[PDB]
Amino acid sequence: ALTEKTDIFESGRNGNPNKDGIKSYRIPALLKTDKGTLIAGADERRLHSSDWGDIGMVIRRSEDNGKTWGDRVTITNLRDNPKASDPSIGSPVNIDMVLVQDPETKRIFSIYDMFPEGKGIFGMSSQKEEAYKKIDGKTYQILYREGEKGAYTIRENGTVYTPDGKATDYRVVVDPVKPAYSDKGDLYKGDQLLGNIYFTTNKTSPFRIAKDSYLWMSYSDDDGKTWSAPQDITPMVKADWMKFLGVGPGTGIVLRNGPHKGRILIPVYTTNNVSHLDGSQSSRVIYSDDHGKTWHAGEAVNDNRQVDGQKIHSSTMNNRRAQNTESTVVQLNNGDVKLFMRGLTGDLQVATSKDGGVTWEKDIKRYPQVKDVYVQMSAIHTMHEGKEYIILSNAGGPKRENGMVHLARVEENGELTWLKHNPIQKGEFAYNSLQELGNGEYGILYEHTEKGQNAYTLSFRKFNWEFLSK
Amino acid sequence: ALTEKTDIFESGRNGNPNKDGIKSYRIPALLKTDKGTLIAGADERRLHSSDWGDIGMVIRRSEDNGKTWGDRVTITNLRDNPKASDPSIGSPVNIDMVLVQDPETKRIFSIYDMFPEGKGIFGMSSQKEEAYKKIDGKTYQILYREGEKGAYTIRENGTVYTPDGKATDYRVVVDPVKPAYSDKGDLYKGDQLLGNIYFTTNKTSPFRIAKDSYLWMSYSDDDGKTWSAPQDITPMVKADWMKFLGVGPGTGIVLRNGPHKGRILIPVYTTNNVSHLDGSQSSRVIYSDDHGKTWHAGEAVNDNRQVDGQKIHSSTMNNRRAQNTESTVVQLNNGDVKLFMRGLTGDLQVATSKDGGVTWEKDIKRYPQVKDVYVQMSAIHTMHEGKEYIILSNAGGPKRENGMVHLARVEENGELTWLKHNPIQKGEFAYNSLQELGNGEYGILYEHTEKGQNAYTLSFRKFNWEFLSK
Numbered sequence: 031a032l033t034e035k036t037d038i039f040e041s042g043r044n045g046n047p048n049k050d051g052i053k054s055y056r057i058p059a060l061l062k063t064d065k066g067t068l069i070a071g072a073d074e075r076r077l078h079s080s081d082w083g084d085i086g087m088v089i090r091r092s093e094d095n096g097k098t099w100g101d102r103v104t105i106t107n108l109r110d111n112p113k114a115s116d117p118s119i120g121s122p123v124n125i126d127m128v129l130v131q132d133p134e135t136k137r138i139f140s141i142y143d144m145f146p147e148g149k150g151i152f153g154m155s156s157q158k159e160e161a162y163k164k165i166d167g168k169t170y171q172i173l174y175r176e177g178e179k180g181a182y183t184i185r186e187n188g189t190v191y192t193p194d195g196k197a198t199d200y201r202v203v204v205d206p207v208k209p210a211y212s213d214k215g216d217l218y219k220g221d222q223l224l225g226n227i228y229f230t231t232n233k234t235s236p237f238r239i240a241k242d243s244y245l246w247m248s249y250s251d252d253d254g255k256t257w258s259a260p261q262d263i264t265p266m267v268k269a270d271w272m273k274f275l276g277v278g279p280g281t282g283i284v285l286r287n288g289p290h291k292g293r294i295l296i297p298v299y300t301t302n303n304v305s306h307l308d309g310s311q312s313s314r315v316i317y318s319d320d321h322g323k324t325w326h327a328g329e330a331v332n333d334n335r336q337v338d339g340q341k342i343h344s345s346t347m348n349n350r351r352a353q354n355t356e357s358t359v360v361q362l363n364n365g366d367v368k369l370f371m372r373g374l375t376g377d378l379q380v381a382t383s384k385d386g387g388v389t390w391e392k393d394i395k396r397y398p399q400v401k402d403v404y405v406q407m408s409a410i411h412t413m414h415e416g417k418e419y420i421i422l423s424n425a426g427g428p429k430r431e432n433g434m435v436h437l438a439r440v441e442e443n444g445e446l447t448w449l450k451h452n453p454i455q456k457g458e459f460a461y462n463s464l465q466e467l468g469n470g471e472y473g474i475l476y477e478h479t480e481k482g483q484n485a486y487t488l489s490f491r492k493f494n495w496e497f498l499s500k
Numbered sequence: 501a502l503t504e505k506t507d508i509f510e511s512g513r514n515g516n517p518n519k520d521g522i523k524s525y526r527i528p529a530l531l532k533t534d535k536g537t538l539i540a541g542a543d544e545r546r547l548h549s550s551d552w553g554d555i556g557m558v559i560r561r562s563e564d565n566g567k568t569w570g571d572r573v574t575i576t577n578l579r580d581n582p583k584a585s586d587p588s589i590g591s592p593v594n595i596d597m598v599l600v601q602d603p604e605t606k607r608i609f610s611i612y613d614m615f616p617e618g619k620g621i622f623g624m625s626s627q628k629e630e631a632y633k634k635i636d637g638k639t640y641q642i643l644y645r646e647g648e649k650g651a652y653t654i655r656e657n658g659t660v661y662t663p664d665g666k667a668t669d670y671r672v673v674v675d676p677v678k679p680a681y682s683d684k685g686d687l688y689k690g691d692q693l694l695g696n697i698y699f700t701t702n703k704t705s706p707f708r709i710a711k712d713s714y715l716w717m718s719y720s721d722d723d724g725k726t727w728s729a730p731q732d733i734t735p736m737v738k739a740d741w742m743k744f745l746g747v748g749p750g751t752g753i754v755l756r757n758g759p760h761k762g763r764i765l766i767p768v769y770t771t772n773n774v775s776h777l778d779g780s781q782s783s784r785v786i787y788s789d790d791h792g793k794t795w796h797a798g799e800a801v802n803d804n805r806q807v808d809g810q811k812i813h814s815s816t817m818n819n820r821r822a823q824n825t826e827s828t829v830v831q832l833n834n835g836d837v838k839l840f841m842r843g844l845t846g847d848l849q850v851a852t853s854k855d856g857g858v859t860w861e862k863d864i865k866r867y868p869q870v871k872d873v874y875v876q877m878s879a880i881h882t883m884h885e886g887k888e889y890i891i892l893s894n895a896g897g898p899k900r901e902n903g904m905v906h907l908a909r910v911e912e913n914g915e916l917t918w919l920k921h922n923p924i925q926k927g928e929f930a931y932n933s934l935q936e937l938g939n940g941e942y943g944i945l946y947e948h949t950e951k952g953q954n955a956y957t958l959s960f961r962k963f964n965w966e967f968l969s970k
């Protein structure tokens with residue numbers, strides 16, 4: 031019923047780097063393509079297991095349903111600041127991905143966070159820095175020059191314009207060409223490399239982007255073999271009030287029925303400037319109706335939500351327990367969208383959208399049958415013999431341990447009836463990503479450590495309906 | 501040299517209403533029109549002196565340079581909520597106006613704050629309510645229905661639509677016809693008047709607008725005699741992070757030189773959700789480059805301002821002493837814009853814009869020569885044979901008392917040198933509005949009380965250069 035674990039991304043041991051010089055792997059995403067390929071994505075955390083530093087967005091492909099795996103394809107890996115005093119925080123950061131395939135165009139998307147050099151979500155400034163400027167109907171990324179108040183802009187061809195709208199002799203690499211696109215943001219004067227717009231300390235160039243939270247996208251048209259250069263989707267989806275805006279890691283969905291059929295959903299979450307990570311983490315989705323060309327923000331589950339007899343908003347809330355963070359998204363046969371949200375209640379929180387993920391119903395459903403220890407989860411839709419189900423995997427607890435696979439029957443009204451709860455991994459268990467394999471078989475890429483492994487090694491297992499019914 | 505005061509708007513005495521049933525007048529604006537008319541604007545605060553309640557936006561006209569004044573013209577006066585428990589707070593609020601005339605079109609504009617029923621800026625909720633929705637490129641004001649989470653919208657001809665986009669048979673009066681437009685916001689179901697969308701308590705209708713801060717505009721094309729219905733300009737200028745956004749009352753300007761000549765400038769200020777009135781009040785201007793048709797927000801003086809070693813932003817700041825609030829705007833002959841801002845340093849703070857009010861230079865200039873007791877001021881540009889000056893008026897202190905007219909020379913540098921400091925009114929003195937009358941004469945309209953008069957009576961004086969030279 032259930033296979034042995036095949037390690038896909040292997041972490042180092044006892045606090046040391048593995049043989050490739052990588053201490054850590056984190057944040058699995060598992061995608062089954064139209065060819066039948068399995069794409070396994072991960073944070074490649076070179077220097078340590080923490081949520082920052084030098085991190086590549088990496089995939090491996092299985093052209094045989096999880097039996098054997100090809101070599102690592104690196105989607106994006108921004109080069110580190112060679113002059114940073116502390117290399118553990120000395121790199122521009124990419125962190126956390128969501129994979130999805132457009133079932134019509136066959137395009138595969140990787141959407142992931144981006145920060146300039148520093149500590150990621152843990153090094154955000156208290157004060158807003160404007161990141162973008164609209165000039166004659168065009169949106170440009172801003173640059174700040176040391177000692178100057180004014181907003182420089184990156185305009186056509188990467189050419190840097192002054193605050194007062196004059197071209198300079200500086201340009202930015204806006205069309206990176208190097209492997210892993212490690213030249214992105216490089217700042218030139220002519221053909222002299224000066225530095226990089228993502229460096230924040232001990233800079234050798236005069237320019238940097240706003241110290242903010244960004245959202246990037248990369249895509250593949252050849253089943254995950256090669257990848258586009260990073261596309262900055264931030265200004266399409268990030269409101270002025272948002273502090274953090276980042277993905278809920280794993281695998282997104284494409285709506286298969288109802289008025290919004292073909293819509294791509296990407297779970298994300300925000301914080302605000304009132305209470306940031308202490309009281310404002312709020313789930314929502316971004317979506318595309320045009321096959322991934324343009325992106326829109328849905329409303330938050332927390333927007334106009336009644337809490338303890340009073341209305342809150344994702345932009346103003348300061349309520350630790352009312353937060354919802356990383357989430358996993360599923361569309362039902364009746365057309366409802368369910369959002370399963372990592373939260374702080376001890377048990378499973380679920381929001382429902384009747385309009386394709388744009389707005390959410392007033393109640394969040396809490397399911398005591400499914401434990402949540404405040405950790406990522408995944409959930410997928412599945413049809414077994416014409417009956418409708420959802421499979422959800424997360425840690426059983428009491429800590430980030432004991433991988434549980436849950437089975438729910440979905441009722442005609444969209445309610446969830448939990449049937450079975452089946453252990454899939456003893457010991458350490460954290461982030462995971464489920465897929466349908468196409469028989470009655472299901473795949474799962476997850477975080478687990480054993481035998482002194484650094485957090486985490488990411489492993490793959492198959493399981494059938496015989497395992498689910500147990 | 502200095503004329504006796506002419507009382508333009510007289511308040512009641514000893515806490516009682518005046519003959520017209522008005523306890524209080526506040527917030528003077530004075531405008532000299534192309535025809536030579538003087539328009540004196542005010543808040544007509546019927547029930548009490550505070551920053552809320554039943555308040556009309558009113559003017560009087562003088563056709564003989566301030567000697568005699570006509571009857572009150574009411575621009576806007578929203579009807580009260582007849583079912584409110586406390587009438588003192590039982591009315592939709594208009595408060596604080598800025599007057600300006602377009603010298604080309606001759607159109608006169610009054611721009612002023614709007615709040616639904618409540619305590620205005622002191623009654624704002626801690627949580628954001630979305631106020632507008634963009635549906636298919638069109639911006640509609642949102643309505644909320646009792647016991648429902650969704651956003652209804654006010655669409656063409658005031659037809660209320662359901663959250664899911666269906667016409668109902670509820671209608672909002674979006675083209676008011678009653679004197680002073682007191683019918684604006686009225687909620688109909690067919691022929692039947694049910695209540696008003698600006699009412700917040702003991703409602704007789706199912707709908708209300710978001711509890712928020714709004715910005716409204718009315719205009720006159722007949723020299724102040726008649727006025728358009730209010731135009732809700734909020735969505736053009738109010739960013740999503742903004743809590744309060746309202747005018748710095750008095751008289752705005754039209755830029756007379758430089759590449760932005762013809763641009764209309766209106767002083768405003770905002771708060772944010774981090775610190776609201778405790779630490780975030782931030783001066784800026786909104787402006788129109790198409791004769792009042794569309795409006796844009798400039799950047800705050802506080803945006804990317806260095807304060808005590810560190811950069812702040814108007815959207816995120818929490819710094820009491822770094823606030824700048826109501827302000828008055830002046831263009832110099834060299835093209836620079838000066839913004840004189842009410843603040844908490846005890847002396848005069850001035851910001852400079854080199855791009856027609858869009859962005860501000862890094863330093864705020866303080867002038868110890870001019871005390872600021874934290875009260876509104878007004879300032880105008882003037883020429884004197886043929887040297888460039890600015891006249892500024894405010895309280896001398898210690899409190900809101902001893903009105904002063906200050907005179908500065910505008911240096912070849914754009915710097916200011918304070919030459920003269922002349923008392924103009926003993927006893928109580930608060931808000932005021934200056935105008936150049938022609939032939940070396942100036943007019944001022946200002947808040948003063950005596951003989952038990954309620955705060956305040958608005959009185960007018962004229963003065964010439966010899967008054968200034970003392």
Ligand SMILES: CC(=O)N[C@H]1[C@H]([C@H](O)[C@H](O)CO)OC(C(=O)O)=C[C@@H]1O
Nearest residue numbers: 057081125126143150151276307355
């Ligand atoms: C962008 C980022 O920091 N992502 C990290 C996320 C985040 O810090 C938290 O969700 C904020 O509350 O948390 C975790 C975690 O294992 O708990 C892993 C993610 O890689």
Ligand SMILES: CC(=O)N[C@H]1[C@H]([C@H](O)[C@H](O)CO)OC(C(=O)O)=C[C@@H]1O
Nearest residue numbers: 527551595596613620621746777825
């Ligand atoms: C919209 C509004 O409330 N305007 C009021 C303003 C405001 O309350 C303050 O600037 C907040 O800091 O203050 C004053 C005042 O005499 O001090 C008068 C205005 O009518």
Ligand SMILES: [Cl-]
Nearest residue numbers: 225226234235
């Ligand atoms: Cl650099």
Ligand SMILES: [Cl-]
Nearest residue numbers: 695696704705
């Ligand atoms: Cl009502």
